[PDB]
């Protein structure tokens, strides 16, 4: 939970992107080189903050707002693999 919206109905979250760059693809850090090779229409707004296909990826991690009705805030079961993938940066 990178950001909590003051409204409390939604919140901006840090996620691992699920893209194929052109039934869901496995989660993987957004790779700018592969994204440009498969889709040269990448946008840039800041250093380390990249917007590709309308989705904002910050230093390889997706940052997208999600509804409160889209989250489980209790009985959360973590895995080392995801923990390492999140804490490596």
């Amino acid at each position: 939970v990178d950001e909590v919206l003051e409204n409390g109905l939604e919140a901006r979250l840090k996620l691992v992107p699920r893209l194929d760059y052109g039934f869901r693809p496995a989660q993987r850090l957004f790779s700018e080189a592969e994204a440009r090779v498969h889709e040269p229409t990448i946008r840039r707004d800041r250093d380390g903050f990249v917007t590709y296909g309308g989705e904002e990826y910050y230093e390889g991690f997706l940052y997208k707002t999600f509804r409160l009705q889209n989250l489980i805030v209790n009985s959360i079961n973590p895995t080392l693999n995801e923990l390492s993938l999140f804490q490596s940066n």
Partner: protein, 469 residues
């Protein structure tokens, strides 16, 4: 201030003295360029008729003609018309326009043909018929038929044949004055290249990014989507090479102005532009700083590439950059644009159509609309080649008048001022008819008439600087 206005006005007397020495110089260099022997050898110019033919032999006429009806031969661009049992051919070139009217059971189609007297929009240079005061012309033929559907199809096919003929003639003209250029010699090693570049005019209706390559005797633009959309430009054919960085623009530019026009796709052009675009409270201020970084990056890369083009030319091409601080706003075409001086040219490259005026090719500048408290003025450039049409720059703000006059003086261009928009279509045709007689009677030096020649004034009151009562 009085001693500075005296100093500034003495520099303005030097400005006027230079302008007078420029008018006298051009008058002497017009009398030396045109001799009385050239006036005696006056060349009369005559309308050129493009000769065409429908058929040479009666065998060439198709056997389909046997029907006593209107038969069209697209291969020979011919409309065979049944005139009293005669298979009379009429070439699509002789044909002008057609009108179809279904009156009752018969379809009355009147096919009009080219006839002198405010006829076709084609210029006098090329006439669709041979010049002849004693020549009589078939102006129109009206036919009727009981079969409405076929007669409608025949009319469509005549109209299509005319459209195809006009399109082919435009395509030819867009390739005509274009001089047959030498073939670009590819560089045998790894060529220097600039990627993700857009070209203007575009070779296809679709805007596609390409790569620009430097070769031994020119540059090549090459689209990644189609190999056939290559644009080759020889160094020998480039007249001027401009670079323009993003000082206020959303775009970076490398512009090639050409000596001879090239046929890019369907368009004849003297100008070929290569460009790329940057476009895609502290956070918004930082986003402007990130755009300023992206500007500086593309500026550095495209400037370097334009210098590398200049180096590859072996000193045939100088790299020019616009002096933005000397720029003024005006309307050369249909939009208000910033006109930018360079070393050797007056340019506008941001919007199409492009303006490129070479300063050395100017004979005289005329400032139109200049008079008592006027809001704006127009600037007219006359060229040394009187066959070249004059260039108008309209609505230059009156605040820029004294700056433009100074700039024209600093470039050794004579100028004149007038309250009225003088017609140049008239002025030029008279000057083209006899250039020698023009200079004999004072050329533009007499027209200038800088001398105020005003002594009438408005009288004066009893001159008495003494206190009264």
């Amino acid at each position: 201030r009085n001693e500075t206005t005296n100093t500034e006005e003495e520099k303005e007397r030097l400005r006027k003295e230079i302008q007078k020495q420029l008018h006298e110089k051009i008058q002497k260099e017009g009398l030396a360029r045109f001799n009385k022997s050239d006036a005696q050898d006056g060349n009369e110019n005559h309308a050129v008729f493009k000769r065409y033919e429908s058929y040479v032999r009666e065998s060439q006429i198709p056997s389909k003609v046997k029907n006593l009806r209107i038969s069209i031969d697209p291969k020979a661009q011919t409309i065979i018309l049944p005139i009293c049992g005669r298979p009379v051919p009429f070439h699509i070139n002789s044909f002008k326009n057609g009108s179809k009217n279904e009156e009752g059971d018969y379809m009355y189609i009147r096919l009009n043909f080219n006839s002198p007297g405010m006829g076709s929009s084609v210029k006098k240079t090329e006439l669709p018929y041979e010049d002849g005061d004693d020549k009589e012309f078939v102006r129109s033929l009206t036919f009727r038929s009981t079969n409405k559907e076929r007669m409608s199809e025949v009319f469509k096919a005549i109209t299509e044949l005319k459209k195809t003929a006009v399109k082919r003639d435009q395509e030819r003209k867009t390739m005509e004055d274009v001089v047959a250029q030498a073939q670009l010699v590819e560089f045998k090693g790894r060529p220097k290249k600039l990627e993700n570049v857009f070209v203007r005019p575009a070779p296809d209706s679709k805007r596609v990014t390409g790569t620009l390559f430097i070769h031994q005797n020119g540059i090549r633009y090459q689209s990644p989507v189609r190999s056939d959309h290559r644009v080759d430009i020889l160094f020998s054919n480039i007249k001027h090479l401009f670079f323009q960085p993003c000082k206020e623009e959303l775009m970076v530019i490398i512009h090639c102005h050409l000596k001879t026009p090239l046929m890019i796709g369907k368009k004849k052009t003297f100008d070929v532009q290569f460009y790329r675009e940057v476009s895609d409270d502290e956070d918004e201020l930082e986003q402007e700083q990130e755009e300023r970084r992206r500007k500086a990056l593309l500026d550095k890369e495209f400037r370097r590439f334009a210098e590398e083009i200049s180096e590859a030319s072996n000193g045939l091409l100088d790299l020019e950059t616009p002096f933005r601080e000397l720029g003024f706003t005006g309307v050369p075409f249909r939009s208000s644009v910033l006109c930018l001086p360079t070393r050797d040219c007056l340019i506008q490259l941001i919007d199409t159509p492009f303006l490129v005026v070479t300063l050395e090719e100017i004979e005289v500048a005329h400032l139109e609309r200049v008079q008592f408290g006027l809001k704006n003025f127009d600037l007219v450039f006359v060229f040394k080649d009187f066959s070249k049409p004059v260039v108008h720059i309209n609505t230059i703000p009156i605040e820029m008048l004294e700056f433009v006059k100074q700039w024209l003086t600093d470039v050794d261009i004579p100028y004149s001022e007038g309250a009225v928009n003088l017609n140049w279509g008239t002025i030029m045709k008279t000057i083209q008819a006899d250039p020698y007689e023009f200079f004999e009677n004072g050329g533009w030096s007499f027209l200038g008439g800088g001398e105020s020649d005003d002594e009438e004034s408005e009288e004066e009151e009893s001159e008495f600087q003494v206190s009264d009562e």
